[PDB]
Amino acid sequence: XXXXXXXXXXXXXXXXXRXXXXXXXXXXXXXX
Amino acid sequence: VRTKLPSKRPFLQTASHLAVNSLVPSVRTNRWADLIKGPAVRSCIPEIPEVPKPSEYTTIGTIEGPYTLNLERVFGVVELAGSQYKVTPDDVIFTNLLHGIEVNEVVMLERVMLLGSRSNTIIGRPYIPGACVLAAVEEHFLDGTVHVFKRKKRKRYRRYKPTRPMMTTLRILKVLGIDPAPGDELGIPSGPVIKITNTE
Amino acid sequence: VASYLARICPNTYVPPPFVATKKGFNGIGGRYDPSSPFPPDTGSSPLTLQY
Amino acid sequence: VVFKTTGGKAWNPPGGLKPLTNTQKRSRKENLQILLRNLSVLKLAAENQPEVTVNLFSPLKFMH
Amino acid sequence: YHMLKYHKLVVSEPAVRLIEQELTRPLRNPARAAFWQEREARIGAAVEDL
Amino acid sequence: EPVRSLFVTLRRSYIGKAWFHREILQNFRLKKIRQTVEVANTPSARNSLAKIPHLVTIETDKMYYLRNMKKFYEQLLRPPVQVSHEHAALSSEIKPVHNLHSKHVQERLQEHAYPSKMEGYVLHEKKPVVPRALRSFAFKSQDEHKSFVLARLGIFSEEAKKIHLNELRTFAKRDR
Amino acid sequence: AKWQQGTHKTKDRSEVSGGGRKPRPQKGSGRSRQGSIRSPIWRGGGCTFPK
Amino acid sequence: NPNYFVHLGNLRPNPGATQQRIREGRGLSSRRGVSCGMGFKGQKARGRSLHMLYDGGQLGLVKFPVTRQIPSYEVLYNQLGVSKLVEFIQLGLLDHTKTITMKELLNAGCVSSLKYGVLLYGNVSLSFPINIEVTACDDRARRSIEAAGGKVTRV
Amino acid sequence: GTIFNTGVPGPRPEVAQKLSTEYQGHILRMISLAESASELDEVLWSSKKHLRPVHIARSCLKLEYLRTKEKGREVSEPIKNLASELENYVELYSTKFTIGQVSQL
Amino acid sequence: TFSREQVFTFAKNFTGRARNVYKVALRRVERGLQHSYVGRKEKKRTIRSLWIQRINAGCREHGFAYSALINGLNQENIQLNRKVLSELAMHEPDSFKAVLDQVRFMKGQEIYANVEP
Amino acid sequence: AKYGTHMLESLVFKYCDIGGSSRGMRLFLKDYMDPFKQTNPQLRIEEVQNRRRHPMLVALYRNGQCKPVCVRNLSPEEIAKHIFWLRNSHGRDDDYKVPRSHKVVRNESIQGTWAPQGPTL
Amino acid sequence: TIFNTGVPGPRPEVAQKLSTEYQGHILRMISLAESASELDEVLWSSKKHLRPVHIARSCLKLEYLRTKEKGREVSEPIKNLASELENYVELYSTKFTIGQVSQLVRGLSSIRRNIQPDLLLKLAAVVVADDGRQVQLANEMDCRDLFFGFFSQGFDNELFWKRLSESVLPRLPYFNADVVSTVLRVVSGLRFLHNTEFAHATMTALVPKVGDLSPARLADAFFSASLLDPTDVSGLNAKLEERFLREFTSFPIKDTVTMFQTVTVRRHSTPELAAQVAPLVAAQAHQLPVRHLRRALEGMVTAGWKDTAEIPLYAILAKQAARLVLGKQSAATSAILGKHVDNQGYQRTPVQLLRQLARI
RNA sequence: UAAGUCAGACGCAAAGCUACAAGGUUUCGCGUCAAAAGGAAAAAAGUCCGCCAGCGAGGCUAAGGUACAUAAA
RNA sequence: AAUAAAUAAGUUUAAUACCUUUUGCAGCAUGGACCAGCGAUUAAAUGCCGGUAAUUAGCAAAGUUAAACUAACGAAAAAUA
Numbered sequence A: 001x002x003x004x005x006x007x008x009x010x011x012x013x014x015x016x017x018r019x020x021x022x023x024x025x026x027x028x029x030x031x032x
Numbered sequence B: 001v002r003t004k005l006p007s008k009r010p011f012l013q014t015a016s017h018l019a020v021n022s023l024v025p026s027v028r029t030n031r032w033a034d035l036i037k038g039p040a041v042r043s044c045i046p047e048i049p050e051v052p053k054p055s056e057y058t059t060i061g062t063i064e065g066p067y068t069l070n071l072e073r074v075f076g077v078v079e080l081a082g083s084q085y086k087v088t089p090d091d092v093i094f095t096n097l098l099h100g101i102e103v104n105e106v107v108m109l110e111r112v113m114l115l116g117s118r119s120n121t122i123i124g125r126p127y128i129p130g131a132c133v134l135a136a137v138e139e140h141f142l143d144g145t146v147h148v149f150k151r152k153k154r155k156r157y158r159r160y161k162p163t164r165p166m167m168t169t170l171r172i173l174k175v176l177g178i179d180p181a182p183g184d185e186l187g188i189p190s191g192p193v194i195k196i197t198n199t200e
Numbered sequence C: 001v002a003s004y005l006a007r008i009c010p011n012t013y014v015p016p017p018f019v020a021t022k023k024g025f026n027g028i029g030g031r032y033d034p035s036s037p038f039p040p041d042t043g044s045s046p047l048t049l050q051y
Numbered sequence D: 001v002v003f004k005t006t007g008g009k010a011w012n013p014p015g016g017l018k019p020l021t022n023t024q025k026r027s028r029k030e031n032l033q034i035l036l037r038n039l040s041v042l043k044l045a046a047e048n049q050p051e052v053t054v055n056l057f058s059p060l061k062f063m064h
Numbered sequence E: 001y002h003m004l005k006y007h008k009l010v011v012s013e014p015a016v017r018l019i020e021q022e023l024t025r026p027l028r029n030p031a032r033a034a035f036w037q038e039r040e041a042r043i044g045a046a047v048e049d050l
Numbered sequence F: 001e002p003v004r005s006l007f008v009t010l011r012r013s014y015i016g017k018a019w020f021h022r023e024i025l026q027n028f029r030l031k032k033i034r035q036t037v038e039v040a041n042t043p044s045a046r047n048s049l050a051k052i053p054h055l056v057t058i059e060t061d062k063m064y065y066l067r068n069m070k071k072f073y074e075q076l077l078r079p080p081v082q083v084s085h086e087h088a089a090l091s092s093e094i095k096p097v098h099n100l101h102s103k104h105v106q107e108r109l110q111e112h113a114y115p116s117k118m119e120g121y122v123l124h125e126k127k128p129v130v131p132r133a134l135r136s137f138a139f140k141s142q143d144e145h146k147s148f149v150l151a152r153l154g155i156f157s158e159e160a161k162k163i164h165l166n167e168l169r170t171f172a173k174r175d176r
Numbered sequence G: 001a002k003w004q005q006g007t008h009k010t011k012d013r014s015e016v017s018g019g020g021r022k023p024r025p026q027k028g029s030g031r032s033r034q035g036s037i038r039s040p041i042w043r044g045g046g047c048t049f050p051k
Numbered sequence H: 001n002p003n004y005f006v007h008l009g010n011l012r013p014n015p016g017a018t019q020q021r022i023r024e025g026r027g028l029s030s031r032r033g034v035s036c037g038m039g040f041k042g043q044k045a046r047g048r049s050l051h052m053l054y055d056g057g058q059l060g061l062v063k064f065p066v067t068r069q070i071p072s073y074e075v076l077y078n079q080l081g082v083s084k085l086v087e088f089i090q091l092g093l094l095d096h097t098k099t100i101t102m103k104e105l106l107n108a109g110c111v112s113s114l115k116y117g118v119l120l121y122g123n124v125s126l127s128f129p130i131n132i133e134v135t136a137c138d139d140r141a142r143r144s145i146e147a148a149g150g151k152v153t154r155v
Numbered sequence I: 001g002t003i004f005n006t007g008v009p010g011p012r013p014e015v016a017q018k019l020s021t022e023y024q025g026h027i028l029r030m031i032s033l034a035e036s037a038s039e040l041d042e043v044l045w046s047s048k049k050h051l052r053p054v055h056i057a058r059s060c061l062k063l064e065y066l067r068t069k070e071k072g073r074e075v076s077e078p079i080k081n082l083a084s085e086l087e088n089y090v091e092l093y094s095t096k097f098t099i100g101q102v103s104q105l
Numbered sequence J: 001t002f003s004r005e006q007v008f009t010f011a012k013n014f015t016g017r018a019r020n021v022y023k024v025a026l027r028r029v030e031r032g033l034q035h036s037y038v039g040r041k042e043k044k045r046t047i048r049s050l051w052i053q054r055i056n057a058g059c060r061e062h063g064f065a066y067s068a069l070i071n072g073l074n075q076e077n078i079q080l081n082r083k084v085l086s087e088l089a090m091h092e093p094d095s096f097k098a099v100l101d102q103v104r105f106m107k108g109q110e111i112y113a114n115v116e117p
Numbered sequence K: 001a002k003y004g005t006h007m008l009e010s011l012v013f014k015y016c017d018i019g020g021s022s023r024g025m026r027l028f029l030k031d032y033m034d035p036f037k038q039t040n041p042q043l044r045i046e047e048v049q050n051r052r053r054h055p056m057l058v059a060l061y062r063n064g065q066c067k068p069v070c071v072r073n074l075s076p077e078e079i080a081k082h083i084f085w086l087r088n089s090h091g092r093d094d095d096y097k098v099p100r101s102h103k104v105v106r107n108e109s110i111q112g113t114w115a116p117q118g119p120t121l
Numbered sequence L: 001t002i003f004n005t006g007v008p009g010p011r012p013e014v015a016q017k018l019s020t021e022y023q024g025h026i027l028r029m030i031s032l033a034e035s036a037s038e039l040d041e042v043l044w045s046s047k048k049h050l051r052p053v054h055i056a057r058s059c060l061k062l063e064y065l066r067t068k069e070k071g072r073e074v075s076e077p078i079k080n081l082a083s084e085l086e087n088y089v090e091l092y093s094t095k096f097t098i099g100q101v102s103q104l105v106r107g108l109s110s111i112r113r114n115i116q117p118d119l120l121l122k123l124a125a126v127v128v129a130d131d132g133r134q135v136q137l138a139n140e141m142d143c144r145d146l147f148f149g150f151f152s153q154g155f156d157n158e159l160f161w162k163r164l165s166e167s168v169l170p171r172l173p174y175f176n177a178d179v180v181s182t183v184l185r186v187v188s189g190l191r192f193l194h195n196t197e198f199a200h201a202t203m204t205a206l207v208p209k210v211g212d213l214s215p216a217r218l219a220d221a222f223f224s225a226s227l228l229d230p231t232d233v234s235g236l237n238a239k240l241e242e243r244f245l246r247e248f249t250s251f252p253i254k255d256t257v258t259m260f261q262t263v264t265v266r267r268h269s270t271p272e273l274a275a276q277v278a279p280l281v282a283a284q285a286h287q288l289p290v291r292h293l294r295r296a297l298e299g300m301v302t303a304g305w306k307d308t309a310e311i312p313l314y315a316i317l318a319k320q321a322a323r324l325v326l327g328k329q330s331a332a333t334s335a336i337l338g339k340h341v342d343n344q345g346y347q348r349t350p351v352q353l354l355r356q357l358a359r360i
Numbered sequence M: 001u002a003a004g005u006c007a008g009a010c011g012c013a014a015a016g017c018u019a020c021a022a023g024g025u026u027u028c029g030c031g032u033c034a035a036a037a038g039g040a041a042a043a044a045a046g047u048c049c050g051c052c053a054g055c056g057a058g059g060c061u062a063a064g065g066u067a068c069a070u071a072a073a
Numbered sequence N: 001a002a003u004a005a006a007u008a009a010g011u012u013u014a015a016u017a018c019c020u021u022u023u024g025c026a027g028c029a030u031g032g033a034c035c036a037g038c039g040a041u042u043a044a045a046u047g048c049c050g051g052u053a054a055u056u057a058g059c060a061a062a063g064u065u066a067a068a069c070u071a072a073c074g075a076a077a078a079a080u081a
């Protein structure tokens, strides 16, 4: 479960929320 | 045991075991716990990722000469040097010492938490992307002396240690991110002439 | 502030600072500190003059 | 705690040690729940121990 | 003390010879000093041969 | 799921605890409140932790990870929102601060917020007034010099005459 | 050090003139107790550690 | 003057060769500030009163017996080892082709200062004869010299 | 025992009769009776101001005897370090040794 | 021990013999400097108390409570501190109310970088 | 600087030519005096040679402040530290402390100060 | 008096990070690391106290670790550790010194890792900034690593090499022979420096002192000199040939093979030289990699040596080449050990080398 | 350190002496004071929480609190 | 204990001198009315233990004083001849 939870968080670019190409899909962080 | 002299029993026992080991070899030659001991690891759990934050302050240019400022009808909240400030153009704030900037330079502040006007308000959770505040560096100064004194009555104890804190002064120039309410637009030139010296 | 000379003279070359020691030699590393009030030494004890 | 009611030193107000308030009772209940919870966790660890112990890195052990 | 006090030092030829003679004179037992010098010379000669 | 390590956090201080319990905390290398360490799940470690269940909080590797990941997701940035409040009738006048009449508010503005006192050193230069108790220290050198001159050179001297001329100027300025 | 002459001297309480008698009674007067007028504490007294 | 000139105004001692004296009774923050490091009361803190060897009255050191044996007068002799005598001969400071007397030993430097005599002692393996005259000798030295063919005479 | 404090081995009569004597040579006996490399190093360190070529020759010869005791293994670290320090004294006294002393060295 | 110059500089505003008499002024100077160390520590406690009072007064004018607001902010991930919130209630009533409405009712319109994705 | 105008008006260097206490000042002048002048065209820099006991720095500001500083037995790096704080400050007195709110504003309220909701008297 | 009964048990095992008190031990710990995994743990524990000096030294350590694994592909842990050190270099890109940059490039070049083109430009700027003021402070070892390190990375910036050459030109006469040899290697490898004044200066500086050249450096110098200066304008090639003749027997097998091929290219080979080479090459044919075997075959064939019954060198070389291609040495050792399941790493030769050997 | 100290006090928990008294006295286990500022109980040496290198109008908590005095339902 | 930290200048909050002596002192325990000047581990010889150097020391001037050193078990065999 630790391996299956680290991957999901790793597949998230939080630094891309302050790049002006963003929409309401770059903040849908939790449930893809 | 009544005596307070430290006991030498551990020394006497060690000398006996050392003598036996030196002369009499052991029968076993392996230990399973040592044989299967694995490589050293940093931890047994995945590391916790960090939360990104906007840049604190960055230089964008310099000021050429004397200028003037007028009052506007917008305000904002910015986080800087460990504390928050409510700022509007032509305000003066005092902060801790900021490294890497010089007097008569223009800096850009991006950690904006709140923007407001007379007709609308924008709330960041916790920061507003695409907003910034401009300010001019005016001073790097030593503040007034603070006298630190300690004493303990009847104990012959006394200490004196004066000190001078280091601080920085800024003047707010412009707030970007929210439009003024209708009829509140400043329709004349307001700020200085800035020589841009930061291209990325 | 690592160096105040580099702050008041933004466009000049500032040589490396001299190594400060408890004993107080002026000739450490083959360099002489011009501000010292004593003749140059070899950076060790006993004190010997370095020309 | 102090239970003594005699002497000139006034450790307690006249009448001796005062009874606990409702907040104090709630405070002592929570301190015991934490202690009981810790013992429950150690029971889980003992029932789920692996065969081989994990080796953790330490800079000071590495140097020596 | 006098040498450090004054900036310049001027000496005569006979003075130079006398100064060097006194600064090299054996402190003790002139005879013993010569013996050790001779032995070192012989060792130095043997080293050259080898 | 095997439990491979334990996380131990300190809750209580060293003050007021028996010396045979402080040794256990030192073996785990806990020194500050809220400090955490990670240890291997072994029977010897569990026995020691059973002697001080009132000084620490204990959790397994899985519990520690889940708790910290829940906090991480809560602190992630979320979209900003805006709230509008319409005021149809607005005035164009800029009202002053309610304490503008105060001399202490004005002093702060004069010192830091206004383009004041930029006309030059000569215009704004002023001489400070020495406190009465500090005057024997401010003029010590001048008094010594006058004694030095009169003792060595005498009163029929050029230096003595200069001092007297300066004293005449000071006395004349007393009449105001 | 060799050239220093060292011809210097002072007087202690046993070398200053007078001072034999006890100047005040031990008790009763309300003053401090004293044993001699040439004590180091007194003006004109001897030196505690003479040269 | 250049920087490397030496005059009376730029001399200092070697670091570590000197240390400042402690002057006590000169302030709260000074070393040995008020009471000068002597404590508060008692006999030790009131000047020269107590000898450092007094033990309080038990007097434990004088509870032991006394011995009166007289040591031998030969402890007043200068001791010379046979191994040291050979080393001088090998280096060439002594002439082994003629009789060796105490005068030769004194001049060679084997013996420093003689008031009574010289005592010869020790064991050594010799390959050449030696004839030496001393004031005293043991048996180990006599056997060593005579084994090579020498002669030891007590004068 | 009775003579020394707890844990201190009692005297050996053979060693005691060697050290208790009317004749000089105390330092030579101390280095000759050393039983380990560390012990010999301490003797030389505490007697530095009185060492002579005869003392250096014996010290280097003792390295042969200590090595023999520690057989079944190569030269240990303490022996190597002790040998290095002795070499500095050999250089210092290189011009004062006799033929016999050089042979032992 | 302070010198005469230091003592009289500190005591220039003292009353009576405390101004120019060394023995009297010295003890008054040291006691005052002790007050200052305590004074700086207490200042940080008092100012935070004043902020909370002003925030609570503003909250209750609308029918809310201070403790409810602090909890509500943490659920929305809003990290404004008490110094800023105190100033908003006094000088920016409209913005302060907007924060309360978002926390209580959550009826704010979200803003995205791309208005039309 | 205030509104883009520098506040330091002049800087005077006083030193002796043979005194040992001025050794550090002489080194600074030899090596860094010229680069310092070029960086600060708006500053009037004056050097005074005299027979005084110790070197000194004197700073004069457009607001009438005078700040003499002693640089006795200091090295060029130590001298530069004093210059940095003198040039970049407004020259306020050593006993002055800035407002405790860390902000001075002329326009404190945009929307208006809070007022009671009712007929005042 | 007694509050616990029994013998004290084992101490608990606690995961710890490096403390600020031991920040001065980081360089020592890097040296004491004996594997990539250990070095990875050392850096991780000291993450909060890493400085540019530590990042540069770690990359240099990769060369030392990889040396123990010669004859095999670079291990995965080394590659993964390198991928992380590169990110640290990017953060500290502008805070390195000239001496530290040289260490970084050599370490990554030895591992055969290509640095990003943008990073090379930033690293190059550090070296040549301020009119090469810091180049006068780089020592001989730093200069050697800078020339070979950047050359091995495929750096092809004309401006960088122009400025770097100008600063080093006045220092060539005082450099050691081994350093000068490396400079010639770079000059010959860079086409635009073929006929510059710097190239001529390097040759003139090497001629006066050739007795100090090591075997490996001597072979490279002869190769580079022949290519750059076919006609002996400077007395370098003639002097190099004389040294080869005098000490032919003392040089190692690899250098003798390389130097012999150069002579044949120079057209100074003789039957006597070919006869003398054969007995030495035949005895030590097993000490030549595939690259040196190809050189030996071409040199002997050009010289005209013919197979002899006593010393059939061609037959021996063919067998040796087959062993290297097949990698039978690992299998042969496992046969004696008795465990044939032993893992066998290998470095497959390129098809181009196979064709060249087949034609020869 | 060939230094200082050899006048100790109280809280909880035991025993002897006293009267299963004393802020009594004699031993013993732990803690605090002595040599310890800060917070809670009214003032508060020894009880509860907790150990002060310095500055700041940032944040989270312990013991204890959450209609007024007096911060928070 | 006559001040401190702040302030919209109206005021609000914090806050029982110092020394000496004590288990413990705001102490109803001791000393000082205030200012200037004076006022207390110093010198010699000897011994012990660290630090820094000289590389024996002093006289005399090819010869003398002072100190220091001076036998413990002659134990290694590393030859791909």
Ligand SMILES: [K+]
Pocket: F015, F016, M049
């Ligand atoms: K506690």
Ligand SMILES: [K+]
Pocket: H037, H038, M003
């Ligand atoms: K003492």
Ligand SMILES: [K+]
Pocket: J017, J021, N034
């Ligand atoms: K008075």
Ligand SMILES: [Mg+2]
Pocket: D008, D009, D010
């Ligand atoms: Mg009472």
Ligand SMILES: [Mg+2]
Pocket: D027
């Ligand atoms: Mg609680």
Ligand SMILES: [Mg+2]
Pocket: G016, G044, G045
């Ligand atoms: Mg007199």
Ligand SMILES: [Mg+2]
Pocket: H041
């Ligand atoms: Mg007493």
Ligand SMILES: [Mg+2]
Pocket: H038, H039, H040, H041, H042, H044, H045
């Ligand atoms: Mg005492």
Ligand SMILES: [Mg+2]
Pocket: M006
């Ligand atoms: Mg007693």
Ligand SMILES: [Mg+2]
Pocket: none
């Ligand atoms: Mg007693």
Ligand SMILES: [Mg+2]
Pocket: none
């Ligand atoms: Mg009692």
Ligand SMILES: [Mg+2]
Pocket: none
């Ligand atoms: Mg006491």
Ligand SMILES: [Mg+2]
Pocket: none
């Ligand atoms: Mg809270």
Ligand SMILES: [Mg+2]
Pocket: none
């Ligand atoms: Mg309230």
Ligand SMILES: [Mg+2]
Pocket: none
């Ligand atoms: Mg009493």
Ligand SMILES: [Mg+2]
Pocket: none
């Ligand atoms: Mg009185």
